[PDB]
């Protein structure tokens, strides 16, 4: 049973995503996170290669190998909830709190972080998973290894090439075609959220709060940002989805060159 395999520690967070606790796997003292989701709150259901929440399906699809995505270790069904056991980086801070405390990040640091988010999102898409809630709050930084982890697949979907008409991610990271038409395509919408993230990193906060700003097409820079970085941001936040870069184009952008290794990032910017 769940209760004789994991020792439960403090609550790490709770909200729309459910309740997440720190834990330790009793057998080898491995650090884990234990996420609880109420059944009445699970909207999207899948079937496993058993009927489980879509989140479990998506996590299993991305859990193979080493990546910048959080790894599902196990899961349990209860009468009124599902419990997910995830790996837990330590020591860790989420990217939201990191930017709050440090302010606008040096571009070298934003380049390393953003590069790693790109690789993690490429991994997801390669595995047929669309995250749908890319934001600083959903990124953990392993402060010792300089490695980033994408968390909270609870808003995600199977990746398809047709239009999505549903969305329960974060509105301020959502693209103008969603705001205006309640329709988006997966990859192009992901690139928009990525531009919002990169702005957030180099400026200290997201560019837009209001629907009218999102749809407006104007990126005001509140911090000194290099012309190459401003250009990438603005390309990612092109109002027309087809004007947005592919993942390849992002990673081939001049601003993205000479990225730091994770360990160099940790040594220079985190230790």
């Amino acid at each position: 049973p769940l209760e004789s395999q994991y020792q439960v520690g403090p609550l790490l967070g709770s909200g729309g995503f459910g309740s997440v606790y720190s834990g330790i796997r009793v057998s080898d003292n491995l650090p884990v996170a234990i996420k609880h989701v109420e059944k009445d709150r699970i909207s999207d259901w899948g079937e496993l290669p058993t009927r489980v929440p879509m989140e479990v399906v998506l996590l299993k699809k991305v859990s193979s190998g080493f990546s910048g995505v959080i790894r599902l270790l196990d899961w349990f069904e209860r009468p009124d909830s599902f419990v997910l056991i995830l790996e837990r980086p330590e020591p860790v801070q989420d990217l939201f709190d990191f930017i709050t405390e440090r302010g606008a990040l040096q571009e070298e640091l934003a380049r390393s972080f953003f590069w790693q988010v790109l690789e993690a999102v490429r991994h997801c898409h390669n595995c047929g998973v669309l995250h749908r809630d890319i934001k600083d709050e959903n990124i953990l930084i392993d402060l010792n290894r300089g490695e980033l982890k994408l968390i909270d697949f609870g808003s995600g979907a199977l990746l398809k090439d047709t239009v999505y008409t549903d969305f329960d991610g974060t509105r301020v990271y959502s693209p103008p075609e969603w705001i205006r038409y309640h329709r988006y395509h997966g990859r192009s919408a992901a690139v928009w959220s990525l531009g919002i993230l990169l702005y957030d990193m180099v400026c200290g906060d997201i560019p837009f709060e209001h629907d009218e700003e999102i749809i407006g097409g104007q990126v005001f820079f509140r911090q000194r940002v290099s012309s190459e970085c401003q250009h990438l941001i603005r390309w990612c936040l092109a109002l027309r989805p087809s004007d947005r870069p592919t993942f390849e184009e992002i990673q081939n952008h001049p601003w993205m060159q000479d990225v730091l290794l994770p360990q160099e990032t940790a040594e220079i910017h985190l230790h």
């Binding site: 729309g16 709050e137 329960d168 990271y173 906060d205």
Partner: peptide, 8 residues
């Protein structure tokens, strides 16, 4: 200026 979290 006020920075805030945003629920999903």
């Amino acid at each position: 200026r006020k920075r805030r979290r945003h629920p999903s």
